[PDB]
């Protein structure tokens, strides 16, 4: 009767009580989201507070077991997940102040321009919106962030962590397993190596976009300089998709869009979801349950009932899976349905694992699994052998170039942005950048990594990074980088099992049970095994890699290299509009 | 032969306090039970079910309880798990049959049916066909529990939660096990030869 058996009994009882309370809370939340009434809000609050109190008491109990006398890895992982103190290490006043700061930042951000920045071609109007938003948000969020940083560093140091950035990197850490270890500081090296491999493609894409924007906005862009921040199609420049109207290679050929075929064949939400189910069954994965069809809502209730329209996939425990989405008959809803059903399938994979181990291997696998399904379902061959597109649609290389550029403007154009933001936050938390040198160094990293210049000078009173939703509301942001690699990391691994015989962007993994089994072997694991082993079970490598992305985007790379002969590739940091 | 009070009964007991009913001095029509397409599982181990209508026994017993759906596999000789260890244990050399059918519409309420209980902790595995209804508080480690549960002291009987929205593996299942006893005393249960 050592610590091992006591820990096992404790985990059994915790699993039972936690599963009960979690199902109750999830049912309350679903009832509130389907129908919006005050009573539903009250029930949601009651269930949530009960669940939170139970978790706090259980963590306090679980801190007893020293964790050094445990030889089994599963028990050690569950207890380590349960023993995390969190923000309880602080005093009462400090915790109250931190909560107040977080709440006031959230409220001040929410109650403050997404059409003046997406559908406008006026330079002055966009500059006005940019400067007004930053001046009337960051200049108010700055001191709150200044106190937030120090309080969160105190919390992290009290938990035997160097800083709060290390607290964030702790997700990817694997220890105790020979050959699959992963330190917290190796993530920086991996990210930097990957970005150094990425850079030239971004340089060529940047040159192409700059050349097109010179035509779009005369007498405002230098052929050797940078791109101003307010011309990027978004309020922040996170994505470059809205520029597609100005940077289309061949605008005389319309892109593929099969909404009209859906309307002419009398399609509906039910047909969309049965098509997705048939796709997943053809791959090899198990079919869906009757509860999914009965208990889930796939259309808009109407006007008597108000519901949140955000498409979500719910796993409520006790074998309960459902989807909340207001499905219109279009092509975007088709891909969104595929994405969310992929989420549901991933959730169903690890239903046999213990409660604390029912999640992805790390914070970047759910989205990757959904995205690869959507990419495989959006291919022209699939649309031909689904019945929408005509069964004589000989493609033309111009259409593939258009599709690749559309994908690039959303995928490649965001990696430098996320890398810069995460690195800036890491250095701020480390204390490398002093307070008075924050913003200036920020813009430095904008001119050396992503290549974006400030239209108007910014003093130290401003706080531009705080203007973004993730920074203000305390969310990790590296999740959007690693996923973007894992996605392609998976795809080329599944195309080879599917015996693909062409370019990677024309890959469809339907009617291939080997790819399904290869995916399902990783899916069933959950969080039980290190993410290195889970990645190796699919791709044969234990580390994050970039080459599949270049293999996917090679045709665009060679076309851009051929096109950019008479233009300049690269940028200089000396140029400034002001 | 009283199979109506065994199968079509209003109330079924918890798994820890499973009911035994002794069936004697009747003529048994097992065809009327086999030809029913309402049973999720009907598995006979010692003898073939088709010949259940042409044999004579002495002291057939009917054991009834309610469990989950994925725990039905544990009702078989040589199986392991919480139900097969602490709640209901069958001998390795077991002659008889097991019948199990879904009861979601009867035994699931909207807010939750917490009447059904199962034993979670015990010191030792049960011998076959042994029942305990005790409620002493389990002693996890080495410290006097002294009655009321404390730091390491767990109440051994937990409650099944049944909602009508649960999955098939978590929906209520009613289970009846027929055990055939064959010794040299005069037969009391026979089929219509
Ligand atoms: C909210 O809508 C659900 C159906 O979506 C309905 O059953 C429920 O009665 C509604 N709430 C109230 C308070 O009527
Ligand atoms: C850890 O405990 C589980 C629970 O049964 C067991 O299956 C596994 O073999 C154990 N790991 C060991 C002994 O290394
Ligand atoms: C949590 O806090 C308690 C005291 O408040 C401390 O003994 C324990 O070591 C802490 N846990 C961790 C993981 O730091
Ligand atoms: C679910 O999938 C199974 C396995 O392919 C199939 O036999 C069954 O017909 C499907 N159920 C449907 C499509 O309702
Ligand atoms: C997969 O196989 C089925 C079998 O008939 C076929 O109808 C279908 O066109 C194939 N391809 C896809 C993408 O389903
Ligand atoms: C597309 O193919 C045609 C003929 O194969 C060729 O003339 C044209 O240059 C190609 N366009 C590209 C590669 O963008
Ligand atoms: C239980 O009732 C149904 C109909 O109510 C009947 O068909 C069935 O035979 C009954 N069960 C037994 C064991 O007779
Ligand atoms: Zn996703």
Numbering used by the authors:
A (entry chain A): 19 to 130, 148 to 613
B (entry chain B): 336 to 528
The article reads:
Animal coronaviruses (CoVs) CX1 (formerly named BtSY2) and BANAL-20-52 are phylogenetically closely related to severe acute respiratory syndrome coronavirus 2 (SARS-CoV-2), and CX1 is the first observed animal betaCoV carrying naturally occurring Y501 in its receptor-binding domain (RBD) of the spike (S) protein, a residue related to human adaptation and broader host range. The S protein sequences of both CX1 and BANAL-20-52 are closely related to SARS-CoV-2 PT S protein and share high AA identity (97.96% and 98.43%, respectively). Additionally, both S proteins lack the PRRA insertion on site 681, resulting in the absence of furin-cleavage site (FCS) facilitating S1 subunit dissociation. Determination and analysis of cryo-EM structures of their S proteins and RBD/hACE2 complexes revealed that Y501 shows a synergetic effect with R498 and inter-replaceability with H498 for hACE2 binding.
